[PDB]
Design a protein around this ligand. Structure first.
Ligand code: 2ZY
Ligand code: K
Lengths: 214, 223
RNA sequence: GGACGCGACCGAAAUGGUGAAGGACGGGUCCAGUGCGAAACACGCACUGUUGAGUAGAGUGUGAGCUCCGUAACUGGUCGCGUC
């Protein structure tokens, strides 16, 4: 039976200097063969702790590992700005090896309302058979935002995809893009294309939109 | 000093095969245990295979056993991962990691490659169509205006976007690619600018998709 | 009385044969675990473990001891006989 590594939480927000703790619980006994890694977006993992509690060479001492039976914990005594990334646990007591599902630690900050923009499909794309309408939520926090599409006051569903950036390195804000995809035919049948944004930092839900013809 | 460099990644249709390399430097692979670990886009780390020193014993995960084969060429100081009968769920970034010296790092992987991308799909390689996200004509939003470029229907990953050839970097957001139901990727890059100079100043997104020899430059003007 | 000699019985270092004992007679080997050798397995070393292992040996020891049957040095004891 494969050994399971149940990591938790899956996500975490904390301020700089905070004391945080990430846990991985093993399904079987893995002794002390537990390693902790750090991974930043687009980069390879970096070894932090080995053998449950041993601190790799060159790793800051604010990182610490501990084993309690089959439960292992990574502890960051005081968060620093360069510490915000994703952390995985690993067991190498037996093959196959097992990784935790990761724990993304994100920096907290003051609430920031998103700036909303809507972009109609280009004439160049419309002559291609497809129309793409983009709604842009720019520089907001927290990430929790709701975006809905309304063509002629008709709530859309199933024909939109969202994409969000990593937490910005400067202001620690998010930016998001909703992309509505319609046929040239269906795009021609209606006039008012709407996207409504609901965010914590907004006084009330904000609607941004245009008319197809004008 | 120590470094790992994987190569050979690319696009291959399902059932196909691909051979990955893991060029080592700063150390001899003969004295260490080499591992392959992959990471599908958005997901976590998954142990693929490994090979033990002195004995040459190999180990594989169930998801890849029978299809993947890990080896080591001491003559080239390079580890290889032969992937046969590839599937769509094999699509991920592939790392090669060294198992550090026992008395020093236990069984931890102390050094990792930059990773090489392996995409498995039936989709043909295709350059992206770049469309302008023209800046609105009316008012503002947050105090400024916004514009950008839509990079749609390209495959496979990745693609790079710059503005004014790297001259424009402030207020620029390039969103993560999204795999469309068509099997093709798509993403948009935007940027916030002053609404007062939308006409007198020039903005140009520099799109770059090497897998298809497709480099485009579109300027984004008020419509 | 005692001494010397011969012989017998006994004892006896030593030795050949014999047949029971398994870890409280040992060594070897294997197994498990831990650490070490650039070393998760295989290989090697070290440590630990017999509530880990066959007294049909699964040993290029079934080695020591003992059971039982013989041979036997002798500086041994006892007894008889001869002599002084
Ligand atoms: C079959 C067997 N058992 C053995 C040994 C042993 C040593 C002990 F100290 C102990 O208490 C025990 F029960 C057995 C042993 O050495 N073998 C040999 C082999 F065939 F396995 F190689
Ligand atoms: K024995």
């Amino acid at each position: 039976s494969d050994i399971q590594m149940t990591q938790s939480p899956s996500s975490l927000s904390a301020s700089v200097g905070d004391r945080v703790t990430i846990t991985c619980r093993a399904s079987q006994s893995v002794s002390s063969a537990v390693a902790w890694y750090q991974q930043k977006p687009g980069k390879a993992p970096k070894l932090l702790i080995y053998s449950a509690s041993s601190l790799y060479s060159g790793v800051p001492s604010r990182f610490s590992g501990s084993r309690s039976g089959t439960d292992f914990t990574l502890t960051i005594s005081s968060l620093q700005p360069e510490d915000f990334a994703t952390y995985y646990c690993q067991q190498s007591y037996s093959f196959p090896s097992t990784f935790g599902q990761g724990t993304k630690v994100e920096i907290k900050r003051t609430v920031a309302a998103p700036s909303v923009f809507i972009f109609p499909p280009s004439d160049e794309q419309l002559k291609s058979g497809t129309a793409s309408v983009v709604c842009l939520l720019n520089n907001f926090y927290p990430r929790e935002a709701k975006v809905q599409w309304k063509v002629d006051n008709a709530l859309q569903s199933g024909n939109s995809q969202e994409s969000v950036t990593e937490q910005d390195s400067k202001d620690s804000t998010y930016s998001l893009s909703s992309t509505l995809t319609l046929s040239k035919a269906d795009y021609e049948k209606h006039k008012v294309y709407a996207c409504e944004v609901t965010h914590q930092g907004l006084s009330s839900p904000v609607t941004k939109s245009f008319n197809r013809g004008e | 000093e120590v470094q790992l460099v994987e190569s050979g990644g690319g696009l291959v249709q399902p059932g196909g095969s691909l051979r990955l390399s893991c060029a080592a430097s700063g150390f001899y692979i003969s004295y260490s245990s080499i591992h392959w670990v992959r990471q599908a886009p958005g997901k976590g780390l998954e142990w693929v295979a490994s090979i033990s020193p002195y004995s040459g014993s190999t180990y594989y995960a169930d998801s890849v056993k029978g299809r993947f084969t890990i080896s080591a060429d001491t003559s080239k100081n390079t580890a290889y991962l032969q992937m046969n009968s590839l599937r769509a769920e094999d699509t991920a970034v592939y790392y090669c990691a060294r198992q550090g010296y026992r008395r020093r790092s236990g069984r931890g992987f102390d050094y990792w490659g930059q990773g090489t991308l392996v995409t498995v799909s039936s989709a043909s390689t295709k350059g992206p169509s770049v469309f302008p996200l023209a800046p609105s004509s009316k008012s503002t939003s947050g105090g400024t205006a916004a514009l950008g470029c839509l990079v749609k229907d390209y495959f496979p990953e990745p693609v790079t976007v710059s503005w004014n050839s790297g001259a424009l970097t402030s207020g620029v957001h390039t969103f993560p690619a999204v795999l469309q139901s068509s099997g093709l990727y798509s993403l948009s890059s935007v940027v916030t600018v002053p609404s007062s100079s939308l006409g007198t100043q020039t903005y140009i997104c520099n799109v770059n998709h090497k897998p298809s020899n497709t480099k485009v430059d579109k300027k984004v003007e008020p419509k």
